[PDB]
Enzyme design. Sequence first.
Site, mmCIF file in Angstrom:
data_model
loop_
_atom_site.group_PDB
_atom_site.id
_atom_site.type_symbol
_atom_site.label_atom_id
_atom_site.label_comp_id
_atom_site.label_asym_id
_atom_site.label_seq_id
_atom_site.Cartn_x
_atom_site.Cartn_y
_atom_site.Cartn_z
ATOM 1 N N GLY A 3 0.794 -1.213 0.000
ATOM 2 C CA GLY A 3 0.000 0.000 0.000
ATOM 3 C C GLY A 3 0.829 1.266 0.000
ATOM 4 O O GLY A 3 2.046 1.222 0.200
ATOM 5 N N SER B 75 -2.114 -0.349 5.768
ATOM 6 C CA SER B 75 -3.156 0.591 6.154
ATOM 7 C C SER B 75 -4.472 -0.168 6.088
ATOM 8 O O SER B 75 -4.828 -0.696 5.030
ATOM 9 C CB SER B 75 -3.178 1.816 5.237
ATOM 10 O OG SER B 75 -3.302 1.432 3.879
ATOM 11 N N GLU C 297 12.015 -14.062 21.484
ATOM 12 C CA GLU C 297 12.082 -13.365 22.758
ATOM 13 C C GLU C 297 11.070 -12.234 22.853
ATOM 14 O O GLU C 297 10.523 -11.996 23.932
ATOM 15 C CB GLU C 297 13.515 -12.834 22.941
ATOM 16 C CG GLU C 297 14.001 -12.747 24.371
ATOM 17 C CD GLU C 297 15.450 -12.310 24.456
ATOM 18 O OE1 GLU C 297 16.088 -12.165 23.392
ATOM 19 O OE2 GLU C 297 15.951 -12.109 25.582
HETATM 20 N N1 LIG Z 1 0.248 7.939 8.896
HETATM 21 C C1 LIG Z 1 0.189 7.774 7.579
HETATM 22 N N2 LIG Z 1 -0.893 7.132 7.012
HETATM 23 C C2 LIG Z 1 -0.957 6.963 5.670
HETATM 24 C C3 LIG Z 1 0.067 7.434 4.861
HETATM 25 N N3 LIG Z 1 -0.243 7.138 3.585
HETATM 26 C C4 LIG Z 1 -1.429 6.493 3.565
HETATM 27 N N4 LIG Z 1 -1.890 6.382 4.848
HETATM 28 C C5 LIG Z 1 -3.146 5.731 5.261
HETATM 29 O O1 LIG Z 1 -3.697 5.027 4.163
HETATM 30 C C6 LIG Z 1 -5.094 5.214 4.101
HETATM 31 C C7 LIG Z 1 -5.588 5.160 2.658
HETATM 32 O O2 LIG Z 1 -5.235 3.949 2.020
HETATM 33 P P1 LIG Z 1 -3.985 3.906 1.005
HETATM 34 O O3 LIG Z 1 -2.922 4.878 1.452
HETATM 35 O O4 LIG Z 1 -4.442 4.250 -0.390
HETATM 36 O O5 LIG Z 1 -3.405 2.403 1.052
HETATM 37 P P2 LIG Z 1 -3.725 1.286 -0.070
HETATM 38 O O6 LIG Z 1 -3.709 -0.104 0.520
HETATM 39 O O7 LIG Z 1 -2.689 1.394 -1.162
HETATM 40 O O8 LIG Z 1 -5.169 1.628 -0.697
HETATM 41 P P3 LIG Z 1 -5.378 1.764 -2.290
HETATM 42 O O9 LIG Z 1 -4.703 3.019 -2.782
HETATM 43 O O10 LIG Z 1 -6.853 1.821 -2.605
HETATM 44 O O11 LIG Z 1 -4.772 0.572 -2.987
HETATM 45 C C8 LIG Z 1 -5.350 6.565 4.746
HETATM 46 O O12 LIG Z 1 -6.540 6.544 5.497
HETATM 47 C C9 LIG Z 1 -4.167 6.783 5.664
HETATM 48 O O13 LIG Z 1 -4.565 6.595 7.000
HETATM 49 C C10 LIG Z 1 1.157 8.079 5.423
HETATM 50 O O14 LIG Z 1 2.067 8.500 4.711
HETATM 51 N N5 LIG Z 1 1.213 8.248 6.788
HETATM 52 MG MG LIG Z 2 -3.076 1.775 -3.112
#
Ligand SMILES: Nc1nc2c(ncn2[C@@H]2O[C@H](COP(=O)(O)OP(=O)(O)OP(=O)(O)O)[C@@H](O)[C@H]2O)c(=O)[nH]1
Ligand SMILES: [Mg+2]
Lengths: 430, 430, 49, 427
Positions: B10, B131, B245
């Site tokens: 992701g 995520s 551990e």
């Molecule tokens: N803390 C943090 N959260 C992130 C970051 N990037 C993405 N997220 C989390 O990722 C969520 C959204 O999903 P995606 O980032 O698109 O992850 P994915 O599995 O690739 O989902 P798709 O793009 O649909 O394939 C958001 O609600 C964020 O909470 C980041 O750089 N920092």
């Molecule tokens: Mg994605």
Amino acid sequence: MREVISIHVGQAGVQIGNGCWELYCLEHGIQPDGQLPDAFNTFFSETGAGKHVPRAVFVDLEPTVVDEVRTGTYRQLFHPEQLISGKEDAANNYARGHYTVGKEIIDLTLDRIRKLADQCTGLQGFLIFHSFGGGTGAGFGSLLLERLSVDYGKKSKLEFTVYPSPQVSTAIVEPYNSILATHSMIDHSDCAFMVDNEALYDLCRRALDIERPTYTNLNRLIGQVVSSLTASLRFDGALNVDFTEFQTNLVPYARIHFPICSYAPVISAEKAYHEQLSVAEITNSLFEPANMMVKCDPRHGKYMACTLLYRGDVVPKDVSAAVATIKTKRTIQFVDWCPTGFKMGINYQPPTVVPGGDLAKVQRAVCMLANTTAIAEAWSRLDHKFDLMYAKRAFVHWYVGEGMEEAEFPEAREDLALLEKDYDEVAAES
Amino acid sequence: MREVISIHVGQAGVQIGNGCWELYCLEHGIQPDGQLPDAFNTFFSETGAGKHVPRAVFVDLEPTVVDEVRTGTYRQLFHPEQLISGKEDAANNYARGHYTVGKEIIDLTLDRIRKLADQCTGLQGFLIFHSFGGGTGAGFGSLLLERLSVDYGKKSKLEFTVYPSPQVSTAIVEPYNSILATHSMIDHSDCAFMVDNEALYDLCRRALDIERPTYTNLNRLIGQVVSSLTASLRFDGALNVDFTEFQTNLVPYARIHFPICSYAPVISAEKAYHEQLSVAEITNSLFEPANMMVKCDPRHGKYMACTLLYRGDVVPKDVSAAVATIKTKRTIQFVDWCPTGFKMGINYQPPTVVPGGDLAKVQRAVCMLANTTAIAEAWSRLDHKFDLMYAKRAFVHWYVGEGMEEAEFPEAREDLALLEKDYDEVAAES
Amino acid sequence: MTQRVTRQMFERRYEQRARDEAMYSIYQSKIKAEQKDRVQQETDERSAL
Amino acid sequence: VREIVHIQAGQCGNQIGAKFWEVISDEHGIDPTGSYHGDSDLQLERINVYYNEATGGKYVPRAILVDLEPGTMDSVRAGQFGQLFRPDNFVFGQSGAGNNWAKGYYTEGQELCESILDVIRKEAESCDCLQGFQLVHSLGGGTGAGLGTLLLNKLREEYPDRILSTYSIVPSPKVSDTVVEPYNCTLSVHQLVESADEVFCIDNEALYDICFRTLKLTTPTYGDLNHLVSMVMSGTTCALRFPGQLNSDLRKLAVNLVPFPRLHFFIVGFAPLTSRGSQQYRALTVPELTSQLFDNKNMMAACDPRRGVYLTASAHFRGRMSSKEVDEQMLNIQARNTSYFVEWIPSNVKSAICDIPPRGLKMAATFIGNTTAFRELFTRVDSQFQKMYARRAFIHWYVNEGLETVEFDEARSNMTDLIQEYEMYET
Ligand SMILES: Nc1nc2c(ncn2[C@@H]2O[C@H](COP(=O)(O)OP(=O)(O)OP(=O)(O)O)[C@@H](O)[C@H]2O)c(=O)[nH]1
Ligand SMILES: [Mg+2]
Ligand SMILES: Nc1nc2c(ncn2[C@@H]2O[C@H](COP(=O)(O)OP(=O)(O)OP(=O)(O)O)[C@@H](O)[C@H]2O)c(=O)[nH]1
Ligand SMILES: Nc1nc2c(ncn2[C@@H]2O[C@H](COP(=O)(O)OP(=O)(O)O)[C@@H](O)[C@H]2O)c(=O)[nH]1
Ligand SMILES: [Mg+2]
């Protein structure tokens, strides 16, 4: 030594039967003319010289399907007396096929099935095929079971029928035929298996690699299930299971006989090259909701019966590990009333492939037969469909004018209602 | 000798990995080109000439985030095979990322991950990043874990995932993908750590003095936690902890395996000069709910136990003088059935700073990992949200159309309720 | 007296791969693992160096 | 000399019987065509125990094969050693039993029982002195359980003096192959309690575990599974077949081990067991055999004796060894584990020595003992039986054969009495 006899009613049964006997001849090494180019006594008889004959009788009220066998290549094998053809079919009418026309040919058919049983000494079992939607299949099967039940008494009568699909249908009066048939099988049948063409189409498309199957491919899949069931009676194995064994194990009562079927692997002849498909692999594939040939939800259906017939190079320990792993799954909930809940049959004879076929050349395969409460889901669908049409008396006049009394509809309706009440009571805990 | 493989799934996983590998390059003193201007073998491979290469795999079903690394400064450090990019993302749909599109690329990555294990003599386990709300993070993450469970079996699969925030939400369908993912992780995952963005936003504003952080700042704080986690493996230290551990002491209870995370001291570079930062000070800062990486109050539930890791100047007796005072705190609710609860680890390598960073040059620091019944508070909020959608069937059509069977929706709901029962049953006392 | 023991010959011939051939692979791999374990001592000596 | 008649029932019995007569033929050195091609005159001392002699220098074993269907019989009719078996000894029906215990006992067992009894009497009165009967059967329900217990009763009526030693494979109490096990096993024990003298319990699950842990077999075949059981039977009768420094027959075992008439169920084990590769490095001595015999993983019954306590223990040995070594080892193992033996029976360990060891092994042993750990197996099947009887499922098949439900209550009452007796004697 030990012998089986088969009867085929309706075009569904005859066409399925056509596929089955090509499967046996290839498995047993018998040319279509009946001469060799063992287990033979289970299904075939030696007519002297060098020719064989199958233990089957083909019956239908129309000559088209029987004449097809008479014109086909396999015409040399069958005995002309075994091919019984009527004049006019039941026209998808249970009453017409039960009283008006079925009674015309019933006596002739009973003579031939009894006559062929005289040559058949070590006999325990019958195989009957039905099309529930068709009038002849349901109507003639009811009368045939009524006569055979009293003529032979305590004999294993097993049926292989095609259940109506939940949404796919080809006859509008199909619910009427099914309920009336269900009313008669529920007392005259020891144990009958059913499949629905909707799930057969679905499995033939997802796991198998056919874009647009015909009835020939579906019949071949059914024949493999039949061949797996009869493998124990024909070949030695670590755990052989008899016809009487299935009846005792699969049912906990009298009216809950109806099992469901599952066969694995069902991978196509092309994609199968990549997988070894060990014992654990095939065992897990059986319990998938998608591998069922009955479109029923296993979530609503608790399990209180299972039978695991393996075919090929299989070691009992790997079965013991595989079955133990399956029982640990939380999603597959057995009923409290069935701690063991398993029959296993291991046989050292691999399955068979047919030239021009569709299945893969798998080294080992397993066929599954289990009883689940999910079948009560299909009964409600049939009951509601029947109730909608009978509320306004959709097609009462056709059945009434063919010798059936009007009051039989509520009688079968009450008979089905009792069956559903039994399923709910048995599935409930205590 | 002893090695760890890190795989990222992701967009969240990739950019978190970008921060983590930035920290490792500075910490070990490896230039972005892979050359030098020790524990290297744990994270890098010495390829000859003068170059090293990370033991990492980057996976996302869309090329935007991965191509940033491909075109970025660090591009020469990574192996081109390690960077795997799909064609079109899962669109925050669990079904799309699991069945239809996930299976298009699953077998390509597993070969890449397994190939890295061949060069990895002393492999211990995996670190996995998710995520929960993301389609690829949940849909493809479920498919990856199920395969890796059977590919390697007894290897420690540790996870570090981003949970949906209690109120901050960016995706509407976030509760759906979260619960469907929970069923898959709860069985296959060895242990999975817990963090959420909302607590990170509050901590990055209060303790670190930043008015308006971005995802870049949040990723670096995540980067410090994983470095302290891996510090005992790489650098010298009196007490070391690894993946035979960490796992046993932290989360023994079969389904209670979700811990919580914290880090201390977290303070700006301007103010750090004015404190003395004893072992007692930083240890006392950990147990305050305000420092929790997850926005759940331990006072609502009970501490099961903890796991603390110190780095740098830390002196042994100073730890046991600080942590003996913890029991005297009544507010830290330790049940009588967990009587010891304080796994220790001390390493002599101090934390590493990054140019343009947000942390100070603290000579000593501590990391905390604990399991508590307070995490059941987070699960209750997700459960209540999901029922509101599912009562009116708010988004079912999207999932069913992409290969998901509707029967999975109640099944994943049932599993979460059983998990919630487990936490309440653990909170019981005898 | 043939048919069962011939089946037993067939049955043990299929098991032959789950038999003997499982052992040749594992003891050969154990021998190679000893050659691997000793370069572990050599390489940890290199890390000691 | 002192003869034993061997009877095999059903699928499980015939398969074990084939393996048993393989091992016995190897022991005595009998070519499968019937000719004697042995190596020692010591084999000819008591070859009369298990074999009759046919004119022309051919030997016919005292084996009677019994079934209700020809599938197993056609499997054994060419078998591997079946040419020794006399053609008229083959008795079979023309119906799959169906594993309905009521059916196998009343419906079809009665019809065949007259024919089997006469076939039994043919070999029974053809020996100079019968001493006991040997029966191999499984507790499935069709022919091994139902018909087997019927013949055991009829043989008890005919021969009160002789020893009815039966070998039983109990349904495996985690995974086993039919749902009707609790009914059939409950009835079979009820008959076996009163009519049988020695009952040996063997579990398939423990057989799998022994093959993995000690034999290191990747996949245990039924062939090797039956081989271990055949070794146990041959070791039991080895004292009668060959001389030794301290002999012990079946009657000696029965009197020593059994304190009370009902408590006579036995757990069996074998040693030495070694993998195909590591046998070269083993220093096989008497303490090595003693360690293997009393090891809880070599017991082919899946009921850990450490949970319960021991009552009687027996040890057999094959080979030339010092008697003092055996005596000292027995005394050491008795005194070292006083927490697992009853206080009111001193000298709980029996010993026996045979001169000739089995082929291939320089030294061997067999362990047979009695413990209160059997309470677990009966409790497991009783709880299963209680559920099925409470729902009264599957009983319609048994009712149709004429078995009334009051018989089930009697069978449960007998097991509850047996369970209570085991519980109170542990104190
Ligand atoms: N803390 C943090 N959260 C992130 C970051 N990037 C993405 N997220 C989390 O990722 C969520 C959204 O999903 P995606 O980032 O698109 O992850 P994915 O599995 O690739 O989902 P798709 O793009 O649909 O394939 C958001 O609600 C964020 O909470 C980041 O750089 N920092
Ligand atoms: Mg994605
Ligand atoms: N799977 C499968 N089903 C078939 C086949 N042929 C017919 N059927 C089923 O048979 C049903 C139609 O009824 P018939 O087969 O004609 O039954 P019948 O006994 O001839 O009854 P009538 O024709 O009405 O006199 C349909 O619902 C089909 O599902 C076949 O080749 N394969
Ligand atoms: N150990 C072992 N057990 C076997 C073998 N073959 C079958 N069995 C067991 O024997 C039982 C079947 O007994 P069966 O002959 O049908 O008894 P019956 O039903 O009363 O006639 C099954 O539960 C199998 O587990 C074998 O080769 N070895
Ligand atoms: Mg028709």
